[PDB]
Amino acid sequence: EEDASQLIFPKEFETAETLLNSEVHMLLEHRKQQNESAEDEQELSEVFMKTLNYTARFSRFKNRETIASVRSLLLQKKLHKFELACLANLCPETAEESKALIPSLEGRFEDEELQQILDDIQTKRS
Amino acid sequence: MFYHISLEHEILLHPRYFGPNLLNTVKQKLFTEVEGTCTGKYGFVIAVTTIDNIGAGVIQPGRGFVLYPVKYKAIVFRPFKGEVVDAVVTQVNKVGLFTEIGPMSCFISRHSIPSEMEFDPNSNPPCYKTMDEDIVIQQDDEIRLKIVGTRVDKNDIFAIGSLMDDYLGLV
Amino acid sequence: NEIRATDLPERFQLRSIPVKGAEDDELEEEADWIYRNAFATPTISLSRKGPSTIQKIKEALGFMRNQHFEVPFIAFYRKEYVEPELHINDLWRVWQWDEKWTQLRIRKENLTRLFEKMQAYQYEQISAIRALDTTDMERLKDVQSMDELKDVYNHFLLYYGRDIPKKFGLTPEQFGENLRDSYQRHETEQFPAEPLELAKDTPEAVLEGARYMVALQIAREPLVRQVLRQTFQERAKLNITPTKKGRKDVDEAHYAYSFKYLKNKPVKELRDDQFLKICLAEDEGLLTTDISIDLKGTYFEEIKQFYYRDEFSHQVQEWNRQRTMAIERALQQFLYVQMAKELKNKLLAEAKEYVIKACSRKLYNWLRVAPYRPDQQQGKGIRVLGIAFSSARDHPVFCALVNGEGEVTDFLRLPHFTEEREKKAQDIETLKKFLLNKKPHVVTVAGENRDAQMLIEDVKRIVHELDQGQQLSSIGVELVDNELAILYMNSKKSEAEFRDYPPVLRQAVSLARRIQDPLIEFAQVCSEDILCLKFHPLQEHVVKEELLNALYCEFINRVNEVGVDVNRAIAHPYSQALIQYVCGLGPRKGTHLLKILKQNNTRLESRTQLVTMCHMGPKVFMNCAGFLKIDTEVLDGSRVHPETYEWARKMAVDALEYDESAEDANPAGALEEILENPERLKDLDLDAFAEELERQGYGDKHITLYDIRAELSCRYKDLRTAYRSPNTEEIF
RNA sequence: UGUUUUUUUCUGUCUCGUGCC
């Protein structure tokens, strides 16, 4: 029954806080920077390294202010939290591609209304 | 898909750890307990960012071990069905494709792949192309997919991908 | 059915997998590809010369495509068409070159078709920085350039767009030409405009918009890849230096840890010396590796001047600055990383080649069949007394006395040993009783330490002093290293021969077999069995597929040179299953022939047994004519095939000066007298034989005349080495 | 130029009578 396409999740996960690829990338980078110092400390595991090299290959923007701006310009809408992560991470070119990938956008909003958002997201990319 | 939620956990601390570094020892024990593990309820945990507070240690009767129900603010990665993410292809085999969604590796079979994407066993690098050889997909490429299923192999998550929907390839 | 009852032999079909045969026009292309890709970095096949080697490779490929020729079949049967014994790796190298040429041709054709389709699509779209379908022809023609061609094709796909519905700086071609020639023929955009004006005509408001496009164009350009390709791969002084953690972790075990400050190692040390490449790969795996040419700082400076404007007055200065920025962006994108990746790939290929060469050398050294028969040739063969003791410390030591016909006659144990702290007579008495029990022909003792060597020496002394070798004479116990017998004892053949026996008996049987017929043991093992023996530590780093292929080719060549006994693989299990490494007789074909022989009860009547009984096809018989041998026609058990039987008979008659009347079996003087010993060699002239072959036969017999004479004079010649007695260092 | 050993918590039934603090 758990299918994110139809916007259903368990009660515990419904009150969660969405994270973007750049956000988690910078959080892990800062954690690595803190952990590398302060000698006599248990070094990072393979999980941390794999997550780092996985999120580093999808960092659409390095500046934290870019993350703040893209989340601020998106939260003003009426979309759910789940729609804040996938759409801001994939960064589709045209509204048709976004509507095809995410079935929730089908009929939820107009075509130009989503195309302008996608163009803004593309321009915000570094 | 990564999230930032508030979790709770309790750890017993042996009385040998009492002293001026009690809180530091509790934090160190917490760090090396709830990083990298996985559960069927919240999913796979990446790491811990910060700790909210330290509970009141209730010393057990007849035992020097004392438990601290600490509540930590850590991140978690619990992908669901139907989500679309961008991963990287690790290996190409005739049985199927191999990818790596962060702390996960999914897998797509040839049946999911359309018939246009044939095999290239003659070439040294295992790769799939079309008749015109215009589009090329190989390893170390940011190829998208759709999570159509989930599985937890005793705190080892392993989902399954799919390549039926349009606009799934090079961006 | 396709493997056993196929028109072409199994080896020929397996060799030309990607390229199913060679056409008349494709033979020249395959030969040219093989010659070009024969020895680029190291010197290989420089023996055969350049043009002579290319012609020989082309002739071998043509023979393989037409007559279903194989590696040994074309190396021996086609000694004239190929290098006449130039090197052992003649047929296999020719087959590999032909396969590579066919694959390159197929890739070029596919690239040309894709380029034509893209050009047609662009013409249809834009015909109703442009998109021209002119690079498709260049990509199709670029057959030799595999990596460069692929890079150029990928760059074209990324530049034109790759979409399938159903003025900024110098041009890319001009910049590539200026970089390749080393002189900047074309400068940057010599216009009064600057990056301020160019960043307003995209919607970014930043001056780096054109830099990304310039970098993408430069990286996705075949000319740039060609210019950079071989610049650092040809020479790269890789400086080996351990890091902070590598110095202690390696402990001078790898290439990146042996020399603390031993740097400037050029391409020769890594390519030619596969050990250095293996060490660098091992060190670069977990801890760290020191692989840096350190020659760019001066290779990247010269390119900076090219493609940039010379004047500096705003327009000229702006153009020069923009060109420099674009060049820097392109270098950062696919300039340093591409060169580093190419160098790493070249180093890995060199290490793999070195590992394969070491494995092939080890296989050639250890695969030559050099048994120790009676007199170093009563009864056929000698009775090998395989003595494989466990400890020689009051424990039962296996001692089997196997015969010389690939079978174990008997065995026994010797629990008594010098057990007892002070017992110098029990071991001697046990050895004397064991020697008197049977009548062996030779002693094959093993060894593990000083105690084992002392026990073997004591046993040999007891045998020689009391004449325990044969009960009527002293027999010298030949030392045998416990290397092949131990592995063969616990093999499938050892288990099948004896199931309810201790491992000592199996080890003794394996040691006896290894000193009586190494070829039989090598052919009767899975090749799994061959991979058990390590050829060198550097082979592990390289791909094991190349080593396995080299070992299989060496085994096939050895089997073809030594021949195969048809009667030996009919009833004797020890000498059975030896039709898997034959020239043209693959494993499936050999298994089918063995099954047919077992069912129908057909023996090795002659060389035409598989052609007359309907067991083997005409192509299989022709390709495997020089490898199948029988016990009894006269020229059946030799390299003389049916085609050369008449020529061999005529040559024997001429040498013996006997009458000529249908000489196949009836006249025995020219056959039997010639086989017994050399009767007359001056009678048979090389020029006359060659003229006779050319006039009647459709082939020159200048090179095959010696082989035919040797086959007529000596049948079933063995290509294995002689018996190698253990040395001091070798024994240790 | 040599020196012979390694296995371990078992476990018992239901009923009646007598004596003692």
UniProtKB/TrEMBL annotation, chain B:
Source organism, top-level taxon: Eukaryota
SUPFAM superfamilies, per the entry: N-terminal, heterodimerisation domain of RBP7 (RpoE), Nucleic acid-binding proteins
Gene3D superfamilies: Nucleic acid-binding proteins, RNA polymerase Rpb7-like, N-terminal domain
Domain S1 motif: 80-162
Native source organism of the sequence: Sus scrofa (Pig)
Job of this protein: DNA-dependent RNA polymerase which catalyzes the transcription of DNA into RNA using the four ribonucleoside triphosphates as substrates. Core component of RNA polymerase II (Pol II), a DNA-dependent RNA polymerase which synthesizes mRNA precursors and many functional non-coding RNAs using the four ribonucleoside triphosphates as substrates. Pol II is the central component of the basal RNA polymerase II transcription machinery. It is composed of mobile elements that move relative to each other. POLR2G/RPB7 is part of a subcomplex with POLR2D/RPB4 that binds to a pocket formed by POLR2A/RPB1, POLR2B/RPB2 and POLR2F/RPABC2 at the base of the clamp element.
Record's protein name: DNA-directed RNA polymerase subunit
Keywords: DNA-directed RNA polymerase, Nucleus, Transcription
Alphabetized InterPro entries for the sequence: NA-bd_OB-fold (IPR012340), RNA_pol_Rpb7-like_N_sf (IPR036898), Rpb7-like (IPR045113), Rpb7-like_N (IPR005576), S1_domain (IPR003029)
Main location: nucleus
Gene designation per UniProt: POLR2G
Keyword Nucleus: yes
Pfam families in the cross-refs: S1, SHS2_Rpb7-N
GO molecular function: nucleic acid binding
UniProt similarity note: Belongs to the eukaryotic RPB7/RPC8 RNA polymerase subunit family.
One example of a Gene Ontology biological process annotation: DNA-templated transcription initiation
Compartments, as annotated in UniProt: Nucleus
One term under GO cellular component: nucleus
Protein's UniProt keywords contain Cytoplasm: no
